[PDB]
Amino acid sequence: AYLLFYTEAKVTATVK
Amino acid sequence: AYLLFYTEAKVTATVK
Amino acid sequence: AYLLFYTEAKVTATVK
Amino acid sequence: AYLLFYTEAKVTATVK
Amino acid sequence: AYLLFYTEAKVTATVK
Amino acid sequence: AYLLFYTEAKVTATVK
Ligand SMILES: [Cl-]
Ligand SMILES: [Cl-]
Ligand SMILES: [Cl-]
Numbered sequence: 001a002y003l004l005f006y007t008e009a010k011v012t013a014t015v016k
Numbered sequence: 017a018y019l020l021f022y023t024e025a026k027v028t029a030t031v032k
Numbered sequence: 033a034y035l036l037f038y039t040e041a042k043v044t045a046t047v048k
Numbered sequence: 049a050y051l052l053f054y055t056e057a058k059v060t061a062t063v064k
Numbered sequence: 065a066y067l068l069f070y071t072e073a074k075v076t077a078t079v080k
Numbered sequence: 081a082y083l084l085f086y087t088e089a090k091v092t093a094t095v096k
């Protein structure tokens with residue numbers, strides 16, 4: 001699984 | 017485009 | 033001291 | 049250009 | 065568990 | 081003072 005911080009604004013974190 | 021910080025370790029940043 | 037970003041959602045930054 | 053995550057609180061991301 | 069990025073330098077990511 | 085993560089690659093952190 002990876003950790004991802006993403007944004008286009010707020011930073012969203014997810015683990016997939 | 018998204019700004020992305022990714023990791024499984026080092027953090028990789030990219031713009032997609 | 034460490035710089036920390038954490039999240040369980042929002043990313044919170046702190047310096048400890 | 050730089051990718052920047054900034055904070056003093058919320059983390060702001062920008063591309064400059 | 066929390067997602068953590070930390071640094072005192074390199075940024076280290078972990079899940080606790 | 082602000083916390084900054086920046087990159088053009090490696091993420092560099094700084095506190096100013
Ligand atoms: Cl490594
Ligand atoms: Cl690194
Ligand atoms: Cl604080």
Ligand SMILES: [Cl-]
Nearest residue numbers: 042057058059
């Ligand atoms: Cl806030």
Ligand SMILES: [Cl-]
Nearest residue numbers: 010042043058
């Ligand atoms: Cl936020």
Ligand SMILES: [Cl-]
Nearest residue numbers: 077078079080
């Ligand atoms: Cl670990």
